[PDB]
Symmetry: C2
Subunit: 204 residues, 2 copies
């Protein structure tokens, strides 16, 4: 058969994911609810498939991916999000994920992603907005962001303050300000209303 490790802090998502994998004769080696032990458990148990939420606490899902790939892990890693996060897929792809899937539309895209991977394909959100319409220059601006700048952005859009971010990202306040300036500058935003509107327009 085929087996997996699931990494998600959301109790309901864990359940639906678990339930989906069983339904498809995939055996679950372990279930994790934080990212700080993830690298280790993955490397030890060596599952065919890893499913990781992009927002696990401790060490986030993309940081786990970069670390695993850096350390020559060659399994299927599928990243998932509770948000739409369609712009984030590109960054996950650049880091070596086999796919990125939003849980918003349910669990079938996860199994679809696992299938693609089994066949040598990767499975990521498509933005027509990269190639068509008036939103292309906005859409590359997003593509220029650092992994970390993206974290801070998404945290700002959830309305978190510098301290909440620092604590979550295990960085100092100054490092958050710095990432926040770099972020704003790349987005051509000066004020919070600029950012609000930027986000509305690109539907983040």
């Amino acid at each position: 058969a085929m087996n997996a490790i699931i990494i998600d802090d959301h109790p309901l998502a864990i359940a639906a994911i678990r339930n989906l994998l069983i339904k498809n004769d995939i055996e679950i080696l372990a279930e994790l609810t934080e990212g700080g032990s993830a690298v280790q458990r993955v490397e030890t148990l060596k599952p065919d498939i890893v499913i990781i939420d992009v927002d696990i606490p401790g060490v986030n899902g993309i940081q786990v991916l970069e670390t695993l790939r850096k350390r020559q892990y060659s399994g299927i890693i599928i990243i998932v999000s509770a948000k739409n996060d369609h712009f984030y897929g590109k960054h996950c792809a650049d880091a070596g994920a086999n796919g990125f899937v939003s849980k918003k539309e349910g669990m079938n895209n996860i199994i679809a992603a696992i299938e693609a991977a089994k066949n040598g394909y990767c499975y990521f959100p498509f933005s027509l907005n990269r190639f068509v319409g008036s939103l292309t220059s906005d859409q590359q601006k997003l593509d220029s962001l650092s992994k970390q700048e993206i974290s801070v952005m998404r945290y700002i859009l959830d309305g978190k303050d510098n301290n909440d971010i620092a604590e979550k990202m295990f960085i100092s306040n100054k490092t958050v300000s710095t990432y926040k300036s770099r972020l704003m500058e790349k987005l051509e935003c000066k004020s919070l209303m600029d950012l609000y509107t930027f986000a509305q327009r690109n539907k983040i």
Copy 2:
């Protein structure tokens, strides 16, 4: 309710794709065997789906892709190829296709790409070598080629010589040795052996 145009000149590949589409309840508005009329007929007929082989004569399959997208067509485009062309996929992704599929492993990845596109995802070959192991730099040198260098490389690897290519690509024998030089320079290859060896090492 779903419909397609198929653009391939390989008689068996046409038959197989046609059959596959039919069995998945996809109507075929038209079948083409060259790329000269392709932009026009797509825009005339407005199919949900277009399936284009990367080597149709006249206007190159990825050229069509680019044209349709700069001319704002917003349907599903899936490039296909008779060879593995693993690296070619990134270029089609960067040019706005929804997917790239090798016919080598059969038609079932075409229907899967289509189901991906219908769910808002794209379906491209996964290159582990881009992220893990000893071939990561080679793997990005291939990513650097221009559309024209690729065409030429793919021809060298096919066994065409300078004349065949000049004829094939509609150009003079020295616009080809031009392309041939930047190609080799980007791939850091001196001799034909350096190239053969590179192609063996990276599986092209």
